[PDB]
Amino acid sequence: APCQNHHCKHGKVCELDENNTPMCVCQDPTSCPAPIGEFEKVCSNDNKTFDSSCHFFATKCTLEGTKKGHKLHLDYIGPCKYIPPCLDSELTEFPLRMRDWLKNVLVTLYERDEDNNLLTEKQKLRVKKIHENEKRLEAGDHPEKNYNMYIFPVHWQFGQLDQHPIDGYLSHTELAPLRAPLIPMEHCTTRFFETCDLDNDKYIALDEWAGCFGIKQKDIDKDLVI
Ligand SMILES: *[C@@H]1O[C@H](CO)[C@@H](O[C@@H]2O[C@H](CO)[C@@H](O)[C@H](O)[C@H]2NC(C)=O)[C@H](O)[C@H]1NC(C)=O
Ligand SMILES: [Ca+2]
């Protein structure tokens, strides 16, 4: 009961202490379901394929406070596989291909006001504009170059990723979604983002993220990540 409304970080669970006070202990891997399929497995950064995020996160939890735990991160969903190397040319296109991908992902994702449900008004307006522009690209005699149409998609993506935990930085684990097969040149994600980790704290901060995609510091709005 004391735990029914008590929530714990990823890889943890609430258990009552001696005083009956709820407390978050690392989850029991045995209390993790068996995957329905191989696709539900995940790959850590040291090329070790855990059986599910539950298994991974619970494992990483015991290692909390440890060096090994500090460096342990989810690389990508699905079992481990051969990942080709990111050639230097690939790494140069990555930000370019990525930001267009993000814009497009945003256009088909948020198409109607029903899609724009969890978006603030400021954001709703940004996608409206994105849509106004896209329609124009589908009919203007001579297409124009529009970097502005990248600002929101780029901010959006950051907020989407900044979840575990929502702190304003993206960890190797949080970038896992960007290592999926759908992403263009996903194999360049780690190399690229490392390139973005300016102060080298192993976290990509909003300015680091934005900067890496070519968003002017003037156009870095945190509201767009709300
Ligand atoms: C990471 O682990 C996976 C699984 O152990 C490795 O993938 C296999 O790699 C060899 C060739 O590199 C193939 O014969 C297997 O069929 C592979 N396929 C996959 C889908 O697992 C992978 O090579 C490991 N290491 C690296 C650096 O990728
Ligand atoms: Ca985070």
Ligand SMILES: [Ca+2]
């Ligand atoms: Ca791909």
Ligand SMILES: [Ca+2]
């Ligand atoms: Ca950093």
